[PDB]
Symmetry: C5
Subunit: 52 residues, 5 copies
């Protein structure tokens, strides 16, 4: 019953930490950006590899 509510809450937690009262938000923000950038780096590596 409330199983789904927990999951819903988990979703909220994921979206609440990134906006937590503490300025640590910038840290998470920094990680998400870094991760996305890393993914791009990997994609570029894969592109180089795939093409060559």
């Amino acid at each position: 019953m409330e199983k789904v509510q927990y999951l819903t809450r988990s979703a909220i937690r994921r979206a609440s930490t990134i906006e937590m009262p503490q300025q640590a938000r910038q840290n998470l923000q920094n990680l998400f950006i870094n991760f996305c950038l890393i993914l791009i780096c990997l994609l570029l590596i894969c592109i180089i590899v795939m093409l060559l």
Copy 2:
């Protein structure tokens, strides 16, 4: 009549939240950046797929 005004306001809201008094601006800022980065990642994926 004021229909357009509401839309205009909606535009303002979109541009006001990103600069809301709260430091949560960084959170939104983080999301826009993440989304843009994600789009790039997808584009790169599409490039890999299209080329290969």
Copy 3:
């Protein structure tokens, strides 16, 4: 005479807002980054289109 001074000031304004006393700097900072990312996205789109 002072025409050029106004332009010089305009240049300063462009470089002063991004560093305005208010923490809104992050908002502008966010936009410049988003715009640059958007340009990259467009470039990638153009690359996909050009190649394919």
Copy 4:
């Protein structure tokens, strides 16, 4: 024995500085992002070189 603990701590240090109490977090955050972007730039250079 505690050798591994030191390494574990070193890992924590790497993840603690990026979130240090000071707002200098943004500086580190800036560097990680810059480094990732730089890597992308290099990758792009390598792509240009590899393709051409």
Copy 5:
């Protein structure tokens, strides 16, 4: 003699401003990120041009 020390200091200055006490760090941080992104944009342009 102290010539090198000045250069060393210059290096420190470059790494001290990005982490200056003022929150203007975000402004510099913004510029480094924008510049890196711009370089990527240019690289992409060069890629489009080189390939096509």
